[PDB]
Amino acid sequence: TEQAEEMTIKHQLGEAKVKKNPEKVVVFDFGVLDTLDKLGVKVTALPQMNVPKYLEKYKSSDYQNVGSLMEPDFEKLSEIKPDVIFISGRQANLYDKLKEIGPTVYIGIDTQHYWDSFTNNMKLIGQMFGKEKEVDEELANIEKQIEEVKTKAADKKALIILTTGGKVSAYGKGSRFGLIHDVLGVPAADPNLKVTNPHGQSVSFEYIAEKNPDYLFVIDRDAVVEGKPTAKQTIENALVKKTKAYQNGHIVYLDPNYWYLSGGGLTSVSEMIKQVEEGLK
Numbered sequence: 692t693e694q695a696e697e698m699t700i701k702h703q704l705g706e707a708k709v710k711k712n713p714e715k716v717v718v719f720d721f722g723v724l725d726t727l728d729k730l731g732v733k734v735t736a737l738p739q740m741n742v743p744k745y746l747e748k749y750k751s752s753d754y755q756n757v758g759s760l761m762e763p764d765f766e767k768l769s770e771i772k773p774d775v776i777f778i779s780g781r782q783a784n785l786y787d788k789l790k791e792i793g794p795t796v797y798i799g800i801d802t803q804h805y806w807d808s809f810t811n812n813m814k815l816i817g818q819m820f821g822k823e824k825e826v827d828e829e830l831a832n833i834e835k836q837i838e839e840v841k842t843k844a845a846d847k848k849a850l851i852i853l854t855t856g857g858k859v860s861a862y863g864k865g866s867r868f869g870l871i872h873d874v875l876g877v878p879a880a881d882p883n884l885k886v887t888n889p890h891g892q893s894v895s896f897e898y899i900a901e902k903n904p905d906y907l908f909v910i911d912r913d914a915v916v917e918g919k920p921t922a923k924q925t926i927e928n929a930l931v932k933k934t935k936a937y938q939n940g941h942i943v944y945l946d947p948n949y950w951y952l953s954g955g956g957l958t959s960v961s962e963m964i965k966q967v968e969e970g971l972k
């Protein structure tokens with residue numbers, strides 16, 4: 692039977708039509724980038740202004756530079772005329788501008804349904820590039836990592852903090868970093884904390900101390916945004932020194948190259964879970 696040559700992809704921002712096995716692939720989501728890397732799929736262009744350390748090979752001049760995460764180089768994109776552009780939350784406001792240039796797929800994670808959304812995104816990439824087998828195998832491996840960590844979430848309450856500019860914001864269930872609770876089964880120090888903001892909910896140090904979590908997961912935003920680590924200087928303060936987490940050596944510094952700059956790819960999700968596993972074991 693003669694079938695359509697294009698895929699019809701209903702995504703959070705609309706519908707894209709993309710040639711199966713598209714030639715010129717542009718990527719503004721580093722989770723997607725690591726996924727295409729893992730699968731051996733050839734990428735054409737990405738924003739090279741700020742590339743996660745683990746994806747530093749994508750700094751090569753072999754890839755066309757289409758700007759920064761927030762500031763696409765539209766002229767360059769228009770030269771390339773891509774077959775598909777993958778975007779996520781940072782580029783959501785630029786959807787229509789990108790769509791004029793080439794088929795654009797929003798492929799951010801819906802954090803209210805992290806696992807379903809993650810898996811849907813990865814399977815789509817598999818279908819688009821004929822890598823369904825490799826994706827399924829890799830999702831299988833990640834499930835095994837999840838099953839290992841869920842079995843020690845136990846009586847250990849965790850709070851998730853991001854540091855930037857000497858300030859602290861928090862994340863809980865259903866949030867950007869909700870997977871620690873929602874997928875990996877770690878109970879929340881504050882189960883009623885509802886955060887939908889990319890940069891979290893501003894909290895005081897007094898609030899952290901009162902919640903007194905067993906574990907403190909910390910994401911150093913300035914390490915990747917400014918290129919200067921500030922998390923440790925920021926959180927190592929007397930109110931925080933009260934907490935079980937500090938006292939018991941259960942402050943876990945998550946790698947912002949993975950967690951903040953990236954996320955939601957085969958490699959980033961795997962590595963993110965390994966970082967949680969390591970902190971909890």
Ligand SMILES: O=C(NCCCC[C@H](NC(=O)c1cccc(O)c1O)C(=O)O)c1cccc(O)c1O
Nearest residue numbers: 741760761779780781782783889890915916951952
């Ligand atoms: O829409 C987003 N951000 C808009 C506000 C940017 C504020 C601005 N942020 C940065 O410069 C920045 C640079 C590189 C990566 C980031 O994630 C940044 O927030 C600032 O600190 O002055 C966004 C969406 C999803 C995930 C994010 O981390 C976002 O920043």
Ligand SMILES: [Fe+3]
Nearest residue numbers: 781889890916
């Ligand atoms: Fe940001």
